[PDB]
Design a protein around this ligand. Sequence first.
Ligand SMILES: */C=C/C(=O)N1CCC(C(=O)N(C)CC(=O)N2CCN(c3nc(-c4cnc(N)nc4C(F)F)nc(N4CCOCC4)n3)CC2)CC1
Length: 853
Amino acid sequence: NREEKILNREIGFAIGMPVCEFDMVKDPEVQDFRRNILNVCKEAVDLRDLNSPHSRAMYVYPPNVESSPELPKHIYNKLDKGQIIVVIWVIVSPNNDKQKYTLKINHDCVPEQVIAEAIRKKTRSQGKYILKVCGCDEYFLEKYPLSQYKYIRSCIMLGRMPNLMLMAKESLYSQLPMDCFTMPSYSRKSLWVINSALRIKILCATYVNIYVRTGIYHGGEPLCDNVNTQRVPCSNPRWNEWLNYDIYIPDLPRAARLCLSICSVKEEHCPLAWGNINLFDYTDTLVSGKMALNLWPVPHGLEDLLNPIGVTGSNPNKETPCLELEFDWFSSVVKFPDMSVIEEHANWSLRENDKEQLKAISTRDPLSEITEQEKDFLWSHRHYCVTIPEILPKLLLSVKWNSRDEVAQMYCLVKDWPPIKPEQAMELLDCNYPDPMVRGFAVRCLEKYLTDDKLSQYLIQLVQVLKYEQYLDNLLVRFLLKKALTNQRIGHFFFWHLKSEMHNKTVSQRFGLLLESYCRACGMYLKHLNRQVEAMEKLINLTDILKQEKKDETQKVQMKFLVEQMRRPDFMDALQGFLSPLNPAHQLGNLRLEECRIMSSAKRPLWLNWENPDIMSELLFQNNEIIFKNGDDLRQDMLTLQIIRIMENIWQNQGLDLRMLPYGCLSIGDCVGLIEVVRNSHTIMQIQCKGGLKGALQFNSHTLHQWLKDKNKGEIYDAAIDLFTRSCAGYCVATFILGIGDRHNSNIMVKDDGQLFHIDFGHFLDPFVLTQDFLIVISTKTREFERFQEMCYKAYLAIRQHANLFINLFSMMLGSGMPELQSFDDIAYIRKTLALDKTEQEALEYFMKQMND
Ligand SMILES: */C=C/C(=O)N1CCC(C(=O)N(C)CC(=O)N2CCN(c3nc(-c4cnc(N)nc4C(F)F)nc(N4CCOCC4)n3)CC2)CC1
């Protein structure tokens, strides 16, 4: 049909690769995934059309709200007797005259009550309206308490006054397209019985320019010793050898994998090409017969001669080392047993001090190692551990995954295991836990106890752990896809986190198929995503040209070329009138070329400035600024900003107001990304160079206080000083805990109201100087510094209390090929700085001493 072809073209443009390539993939799992994944799209679409236009309106404009409606003590104290002052705006005439109406209402009021009181205040001179945020496309469409909306709570925290616009509901529903998801055109035995040992024949290898080292693994742990084949000259890469393993065939867990590599010898063993295969396919069948596997190049800094944590599947580039293998073939097709046989074989197969010992064990952090004695101890008490559920990760770690009996008994324990918090459920999804039942339990916990707010807060870690999935079709991907197809706020960053790694051929297939399904079921938003993709395409083209053709020209010549190329209507049409990838609720209209510029600095970053076309853009920001950087990796920055936002949330919900600044930052491709521009912000180096005594003079650090006092005179002085002190202490603790890279006068920034923050997080996990500027702004021996030290200590304790969450986040991000995060050894730095193995008072003294230096 026509709709099908146009949708295919658009999806190909959005994903980067054409849809037709997926069809030419003669892989049963690929086509079965493409087909079976459409049930999730159907569920999501039905949920969208479930309740007339309101359901679609919630799908496109979901409420941006906090997970808990309860306000912290200090946040509630900032209210006028538990009330809030809110300005509601109304556009009246064809001239669009804007009339404001100020109200003082209970913070816990519903948007309906807000609209009612607004109409009351307006008439002193029915439910057919809704509330929009003045300046962006955010809508208060749900019966939430107003204060629970992130915008309202932010206004309450920042002292700013919320400005909302009243909008007829029909005016918004008329802007909602009648979406029509069209179903694609590509839609319409023994068991364990075999008793023996696993053996595999390595036949030969092609495209080799030595021996083959193999092993059987379950996630990261080997189910048996590794096996080296006969050292053969590379001229004739023919082994035809049979490798036998100390593993009974039925003893193989469901997620057993074969990890192989080709090594050379000088004495000096060095890997050449690696590969991993699923012993069981997606249909639970045990692979048999001949199989050709194209290997992958080795990643940098590989400790061993094997890469088990690497992705599974043959290399898409078939012009690579190809190893031929042979698996035993028995009577009939072998399948993994059903859960019923598992339960049958499981059924067939205590002191107070010891209970408190189990509790203390559960209290420990993830990276803390568990001894063999402790493993057998947890296993002997596997039934009592159901009363303390959060010990489930360590219990799983204590299992002998090379014994079908223990695996079946653990399956039984999991089938009825109590649910645990999402923060703890994510730990069971990293590379350590590949078992399908454990991952299903974790996904159930997420589905049951994860707010979409918390989902967006951890969306990147989940999209990453996706790579740890043994098969294309699994419960985790289905959950993520359903949430992305029922919530466009989540779907935006879902699509972008996926597209930002389409360059990686290791997950090109998986993420490509997932993006195909998403774009097929996402709706009209595919058009806006395509416009954003084309804008980023033009930006990448321009910045690539700048870094090579005109790379060694002067600032003004590069600027002249950038102004020339930024016009060329084919480019203006592409970079004008689209949604901000950093925040799709932000419209970006016409470019203010007079305000765009190359940032100098490193790798020629682009500083772009758009006008805000919002009807009431002046009440939020009339100009939106963004830094498009094509050069260095931004994943580290994304993770750091996420962690900083989480730390600020912890501090707020715990009762210490340390205003951080986790500005927007989105990696959109291979080292190509965007950065949010914080208005009215300048670097300390700027403060010193602008306040330099003269053109030829020294740049003392004492002036910063003078600059702040000039920018804040009168009663605003103490407020600015308090803001500076609090934000400074917060960033002190953050940078110490995370081990952020070298700070200096230009890595730090301050705003006109005193807020301090950081930028450009180069390397972490491998001493905040507190230049006498900061100490002078805080006031060494003053009550101000006493309160400062108290703040720092309290924040350090608060973060030590969530060390577990932070370590789990890092262990989940391990999958991403980031430099400063390649092994658990890098994460151990946090276990160090937080003194996990020490006590609370010990860690307090440790941090006191560390900050004394
Ligand atoms: C003093 C005499 C002298 O020699 N000079 C010349 C140099 C001048 C100077 O110090 N400049 C120009 C520094 C400066 O103004 N900027 C602009 C802001 N930049 C910035 N960088 C980033 C960022 C964050 N993370 C990463 N991974 N990369 C970058 C980027 F650098 F690539 N983010 C921001 N912002 C975030 C907050 O809101 C605003 C935008 N800004 C740094 C260099 C002085 C006179």
